[PDB]
Design a protein around this ligand. Structure first.
Ligand SMILES: [Fe+2]
Length: 819
């Protein structure tokens, strides 16, 4: 009557940044029957059973893993197991991977996929339970397991109170009231984001540290920002703990840099473009103290080459590897709006001039001052250019104008609100033809392209002001708001309301990996008062607040790629085409490749969903799914809960489109806007983060400097040297793939379900991605597409290749928002 099992676990030390202790009575497992119930309808529980011996002759073991044999005594009254309890009596937690049971049931083997930290049993209010890898919608749960299933969800929700501890597995919501630190200084006070019409915002994971003394609305600071324990990913190699790098950069490296500048040991400013290129050629000389702080730190020490004493050297950014000056071309400036770090803002223009929606009673006349007759449209008239759908724009006027006055009152910030007009040439590339620089009470200056004279320098500076607008929008809205922040409410709701058993849990959760973790470190170090963003980007203390203003207009159903392209007027609906949209910029790289990835994900979801839902009524009647979606909208994105565009989740089609959008955001959208940051932005001149002065007026020294030394004029206008060093370091981290990444088309365990049809559908998805990759390779070797896919910088657009090796690769689509 003995069942042979094998436990697989990793001791804590293998995942941090003696095996015989596990034997004896150190760790007990108890089996739980799925087929035989006690008087109260609950699956019968087996006796405490302890680990018996170390299994060294197991071939499939991975790095840092160890397998223990175990033998349960399980007689005929006990039925067939479908779960188990585990109790750790050791003082130290360990990471459990799996339990395998041999020669039991009509399937011969029973597998339990666990992947969880198991802390001392005294620390938990209820015993840890794990389920076999059989998928069940709620109405199909074996009756003896129904109460276990519901109780485990109750456990994951908690009661909405208390300070969360490192071993809690409690998923709940709170507002972004943790970024300000008013108890340290009223200068570090920040508005609460979320829970009001003034500052709407997605919710984040609740931590419960308690209010500050100066502001009962704001959460007290802490040394560790809690995430539910299994979201706090360990790593076999310390260099893969990229998420901790931003914390070390803020707390340790930044102060060290500042000390070297306060000491005036290095020059405070760049003086020529060569001073910037030196950062990746010969490097920068720093004091020994500052070098000796860097080289021992995990993650940080990988970001730089050093001799260990004085010289620090950054890697050469892709954007310059082929040509050092090509970034300055009008061609590259336009091309990066469809193939760069932020490819998803450019709009079609259907009327001219562009109009503002700003209330004139406050902002006065905001209508564009660009005149059609001033534009060189390669011989076209405006009527023809509009009629052929060749006129586009990048328009940061209405978004920035409400903030320009506040920003320009800062000591070292000056910005314009910008509009850029772009013309689609007959060779299929974009030509910038005007930039409008606006200030509030509006004052507008139109700047036209010029290659000679002082006017050419003014045009170069005008482009820098545009890219400062675009860099702040990319980081805070395209990247931080649309991916990281928008996703976290769905992570929370999934764990609160979908069992580990649920088919949609298994479909979705791989795409949540590390999301909560990186976000919690980001709230602590990246978007906090006086943190990395506020110090390196233009809007300073207004940065995160601006993203709340944009969230007012966020529409979940406009995050689907075809809907986004139509809403921005860069595509039209066309049922004759393979994807149902025709691109008005034919070669648009981000969009063309993205549509291929979108379609592959759609095929996967539309195949998986019908395996578990036959008809619309099956979706309606899934109580876990209905509670999941209700809470995700009404709590997680609760400030938008009354908008009419939320899907209702009443149909197979509804469920499909919800899962498809979530997977798209977490994988390919995030990848496209994240992994190009250092490749394009590692040259600060190409992607400035801040501007520090307005255009010089005629007759001043600054204007004469502009005539005689355009490089100095440029560098005086953009990000200063010290914030440049900090910013380059952060985007190098963010642009790096860890070696334990899980990419789109892959999963961390081959046994996540017993359902062979689901596994076959998943294999088909992976094979499709490989086929797509070969298609994208061919696109990048097609000479007729080199204008937009490579450009003057000769950089092939690989950000939507699905696969990648580790490192700073400018390719690869992770499953999730993992960095
Ligand atoms: Fe990211």
């Amino acid at each position: 009557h003995k069942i042979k099992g094998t436990v697989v676990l990793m001791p804590k030390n293998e995942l941090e940044v003696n095996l015989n202790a596990f034997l004896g009575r150190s760790v007990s497992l108890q089996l739980i029957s799925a087929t035989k119930a006690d008087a109260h309808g609950k699956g019968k529980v087996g006796k405490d059973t302890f680990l018996e011996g170390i299994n060294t002759s197991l071939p499939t073991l991975g790095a840092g893993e160890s397998a223990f044999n175990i033998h349960f005594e399980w007689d005929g009254s006990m039925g067939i197991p479908g779960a188990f309890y585990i109790k750790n009596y050791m003082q130290v937690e360990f990471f459990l991977k799996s339990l395998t049971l041999e020669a039991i049931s009509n399937q011969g083997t029973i597998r339990f996929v666990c992947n969880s930290w198991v802390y001392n049993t005294k620390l938990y209010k209820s015993v840890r339970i794990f389920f076999a890898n059989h998928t069940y919608v709620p109405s199909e749960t074996p009756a003896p397991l129904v109460e276990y299933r519901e109780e485990e969800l109750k456990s994951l929700r908690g009661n909405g109170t208390g300070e969360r501890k490192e071993y809690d597995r409690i998923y709940d919501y709170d507002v972004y009231n943790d970024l300000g630190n008013p108890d340290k200084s009223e200068k570090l006070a920040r508005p609460v984001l979320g829970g009001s019409s003034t500052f709407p915002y997605p919710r984040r994971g609740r931590t419960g540290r308690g209010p500050t003394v100066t502001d009962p609305n704001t959460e007290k600071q802490g040394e560790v920002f809690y995430v539910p324990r299994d979201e706090n990913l360990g790593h076999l190699k310390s260099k893969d703990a990229l998420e901790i790098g931003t914390k070390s950069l803020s707390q340790i490296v930044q102060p060290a840099f500042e000390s070297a500048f306060d000491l005036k040991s290095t020059p405070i400013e760049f003086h020529s473009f060569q001073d910037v290129h030196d950062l990746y050629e010969g490097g920068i000389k720093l004091p020994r103290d500052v070098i000796s702080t860097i080289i021992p730190l995990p993650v940080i020490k990988e970001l730089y080459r050093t001799d260990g004493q004085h010289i620090l050297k950054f890697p050469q950014p892709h954007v310059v590897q082929v040509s050092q000056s090509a970034w300055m071309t009008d061609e590259e400036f336009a091309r990066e709006m469809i193939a760069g770090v932020n490819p998803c803002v450019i709009r079609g223009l259907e009327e001219f001039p562009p109009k503002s929606n700003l209330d004139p009673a406050i902002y006065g006349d905001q209508s564009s001052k660009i005149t059609a007759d001033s534009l060189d449209l390669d011989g076209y008239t405006m009527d023809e250019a509009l009629g052929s759908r060749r006129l586009f724009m990048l328009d940061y006027h209405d978004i920035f104008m409400p903030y320009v006055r506040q920003i320009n009152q800062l000591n070292s910030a000056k910005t314009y609100a910008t509009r850029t007009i772009l013309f689609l040439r007959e060779d299929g590339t974009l030509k910038p033809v005007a930039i409008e620089l606006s200030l509030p009470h509006a004052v507008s200056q139109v700047v036209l392209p010029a290659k000679e004279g002082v006017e050419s320098t003014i045009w170069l500076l005008a482009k820098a002001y545009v890219i400062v607008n675009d860099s702040c929008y990319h980081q805070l809205m395209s990247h931080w708001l649309n991916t990281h922040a928008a996703m976290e409410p769905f992570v929370i709701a999934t764990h609160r309301h979908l069992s580990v058993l649920h088919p949609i849990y298994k479909l979705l959760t791989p795409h949540y990996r590390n999301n909560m973790n990186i976000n919690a470190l980001a709230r602590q170090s990246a978007i906090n008062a006086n943190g990395i963003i506020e110090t390196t980007f233009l809007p300073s203390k207004y940065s995160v607040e601006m993203s709340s203003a944009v969230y007012k207009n966020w529409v979940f159903t406009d995050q689907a790629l075809p809907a986004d392209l139509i809403k921005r007027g860069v595509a039209i609906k066309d049922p004759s085409t393979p994807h149902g949209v025709r691109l008005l910029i034919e070669d648009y790289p981000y969009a063309a490749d993205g549509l291929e990835i979108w379609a592959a994900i759609k095929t996967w979801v539309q195949e998986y969903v019908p395996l578990y839902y036959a008809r619309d009524d099956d979706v309606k009647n899934d109580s876990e799914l209905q509670h999941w979606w209700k809470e995700a909208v009404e709590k997680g994105h609760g400030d938008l809960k009354d908008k009419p565009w939320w899907p209702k989740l009443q149909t197979l089609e509804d469920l499909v489109e919800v899962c498809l959008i979530i997977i798209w955001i977490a994988s390919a959208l995030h990848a496209a806007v994240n992994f190009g940051q250092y490749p394009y932005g590692g040259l600060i001149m190409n992607r400035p983060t801040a501007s520090r002065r307005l255009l010089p007026e005629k007759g001043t020294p600054e204007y004469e400097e502009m005539i005689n030394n355009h490089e100095k004029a440029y560098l005086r206008t953009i990000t200063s040297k010290l914030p440049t060093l900090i910013s380059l370091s952060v985007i190098e981290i963010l642009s790096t793939h860890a070696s334990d990444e899980v990419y789109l088309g892959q999963r961390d365990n081959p046994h996540w379900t017993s359902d062979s049809k689901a596994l076959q559908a998943f294999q088909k998805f992976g094979n499709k991605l490989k086929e797509i990759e070969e298609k994208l390779v061919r696109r990048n070797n097609d000479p007729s597409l080199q204008g937009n896919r490579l450009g003057p910088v000769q950089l092939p657009y690989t950000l939507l290749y699905p696969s990648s090796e580790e490192g700073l690769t400018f390719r690869g689509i992770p499953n999730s928002i993992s960095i």
